[PDB]
């Protein structure tokens with residue numbers, strides 16, 4: 254893709270250029286900056302912060318350069334001077350493509366979204382929202398709002414999320430039939446532990462696509478409506494170290510919902526999704542359990 | 548303390564209040580928020596990021612609240628709605644001063660300290676003069692507000708006419724910097740242990756000499772800039788990138804908030820130049836996986852500064 258970047262800089266005669274990478278790709282940062290500074294007149298600034306997705310735009314860097322190039326993710330939101338360099342996986346998914354139903358849904362991650370159209374020939378792909386048909390995220394299952402499901406990729410969080418959010422069967426094909434019962438007992442365990450919690454830290458992230466302050470204020474009032482207390486804690490990164498310093502009984506995460514699931518055993522008090530918080534408080538019934546979405 | 552905060556909230560009729568603590572005081576955050584929300588009508592938001600000092604204001608939070616209370620440090624900069632609740636310690640420092648008087652060899656003495664003892668420096672100065680000596684307290688600047696106050700990144704209070712210094716406080720980084728910055732003898736007097744020692748910059752400079760040597764064969768540098776409110780040095784970084792190119796090397800500017808070993812390891816640079824908090828360079832040296840240099844040590848490595856022309860990295 255490096256030639257589109259060079260052409261975009263020259264054609265826009267960019268003078269200052271920002272680069273932002275997911276963790277998996279910062280190993281390439283210095284080489285890409287080298288190519289740009291050698292083959293253009295632009296000066297490069299690399300973002301040095303962790304970056305977890307298109308929900309995590311370095312907007313400070315973006316407001317300092319003519320164009321910020323953000324790698325590894327499909328776009329999100331609308332910032333005038335951020336270009337998303339997608340970076341797709343070249344692997345073949347047709348080997349991976351147990352079913353029972355006649356209408357079968359395709360869902361995947363951004364790295365394979367270009368390959369759905371022909372996996373479909375081998376069926377209705379689900380259109381998303383503000384990106385691609387069939388794309389799901391840890392925080393967004395719109396593409397699954399379309400009888401059974403085949404997910405394409407690695408990891409089990411995405412198929413689980415689809416299975417919980419639509420209550421349909423999902424086959425997970427890496428390039429496995431997904432059981433959400435193991436995940437729901439787990440989340441049940443955290444709800445039980447937090448049932449006797451009296452004081453809650455309500456986590457809000459300033460990251461560009463993870464900020465949910467209005468929901469946090471709602472959650473604070475719902476806690477007080479039920480004779481408990483939540484204090485809003487505003488931060489950038491959400492980490493077990495930073496939550497240990499505040500002496501709360503339990504936490505409610507309104508930032509990235511995969512923090513809540515992935516890094517669960519790593520936190521030293523219970524960390525809850527908004528919806529599990531409501532169940533702990535008595536505002537929502539356990540049967541009305543849903544995936545945290547943004 | 549808490550009475551000042553409550554009064555300020557009621558005098559200024561605040562509805563949204565922010566709290567920011569250094570790491571040692573986040574343990575009190577919830578208790579202080581509770582007190583505020585029970586005794587006022589205000590809603591509290593607590594900053595959850597690391598906070599390293601008054602150089603590290605949570606300006607996103609401050610731009611979201613009527614007033615941000617920032618704890619533990621003396622003020623710095625000029626932020627319209629930030630109130631600094633400083634960390635003042637009540638330990639008697641005069642016994643440490645007396646111990647340090649044993650060690651002096653000159654009659655004209657400078658006094659410096661950290662923020663938690665600046666209110667007692669005038670009393671120390673009186674005792675030192677009562678014991679036959681001349682004594683002076685240097686004025687700070689817009690960064691080190693109080694007379695006699697030094698920071699890891701600011702030794703202006705030490706730029707005074709005196710023969711030797713007494714530093715009052717714990718740790719040895721501050722008197723080391725004063726010793727290196729002034730070329731004068733420094734006695735470090737710790738009021739909590741009541742001991743005085745003569746600081747020696749030799750082990751310090753031998754250590755810094757070791758990192759310059761490792762970075763001397765470096766071809767590619769990451770030049771680190773922090774977006775923190777009082778640590779941002781982009782113009783300097785742009786200068787150092789040009790200076791590297793002038794000398795047949797390459798520096799790439801890397802803009803970040805926290806500067807940590809994990810973040811520096813993700814980039815394939817041979818070495819780094821840190822224009823953020825100078826104490827990162829010193830304290831965390833052994834933890835980084837490539838050499839990290841001060842701006843001035845960078846100039847040595849490149850050929851812009853004699854290797855003995857060694858100065859402390861200061862924020863100014």
Ligand SMILES: C[S@@+](CC[C@H](N)C(=O)[O-])C[C@H]1O[C@@H](n2cnc3c(N)ncnc32)[C@H](O)[C@@H]1O
Nearest residue numbers: 305306390391458489490491508509511512515
């Ligand atoms: C690795 S990304 C997942 C990839 C992709 N974003 C997706 O939609 O599935 C999710 C991980 O990023 C990290 N993460 C996301 N937002 C974070 C935040 N605000 N603070 C700290 N870690 C965060 C968490 O460790 C979480 O497990």
Ligand SMILES: C[S@@+](CC[C@H](N)C(=O)[O-])C[C@H]1O[C@@H](n2cnc3c(N)ncnc32)[C@H](O)[C@@H]1O
Nearest residue numbers: 599600698699773804805806823824826827830
């Ligand atoms: C302990 S505080 C210093 C307290 C006081 N401000 C002073 O003048 O001495 C300095 C430490 O904070 C950490 N620190 C400061 N700024 C930082 C930054 N931008 N990123 C990561 N760590 C930082 C470094 O580890 C450094 O050792």
Ligand code: SF4
Nearest residue numbers: 305306308391392509
């Ligand atoms: S799952 Fe988390 S990291 Fe991925 S897009 Fe959603 S908020 Fe960002």
Ligand code: SF4
Nearest residue numbers: 599600602699700824
């Ligand atoms: S030494 Fe570092 S942490 Fe202390 S005031 Fe200076 S920049 Fe901030």
